[PDB]
RNA sequence: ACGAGAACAUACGUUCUUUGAACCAAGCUUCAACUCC
């Protein structure tokens, strides 16, 4: 596509009233045995 | 006017009996439905 400068962009989401701008995919991890 | 003249090497008889093309062997391995507007 078109050529711009560094950096390009990131990708948050939108949900209203007001958009909250959360980043997609980030999660939490717990490991317990058996 | 022959050590000659006649005279079937012939008759009967299952290449047959017993026997697993078997045995052991993961269609599996690494693999983001993602990327950019």
* Residues A13, A19: Cα–Cα separation, whole Å: 8
| Angstrom distance, A31 CA to B25 C1' | 37
- Report the Cα–Cα distance between both ends of chain A, in Å, rounded: 49
CB A10 within 8 A of CB A23: yes
* Residues A25, A34: Cα–Cα separation, whole Å: 26
Identify the three-state secondary structure at position A14. coil
DSSP A6: S
* Residues A26, A12: Cα–Cα separation, whole Å: 11
| Angstrom distance, A16 CA to B14 C1' | 100
* Residues A28, A18: Cα–Cα separation, whole Å: 25
* Chain-centroid distance, C-alpha A1: 22
Identify the three-state secondary structure at position A12. strand
Experimental technique of record: cryo-EM
| Length of chain A as a residue count | 34
DSSP A23: B
Identify the three-state secondary structure at position A33. coil
Nucleotide nearest A2 (Cα, C1'): B37
């Amino acid at each position: 596509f078109r050529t711009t400068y560094s950096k390009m962009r990131s990708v948050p989401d939108n949900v209203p009233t007001g958009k909250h701008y959360l980043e997609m995919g980030k999660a939490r991890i717990k490991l317990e045995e058996l």
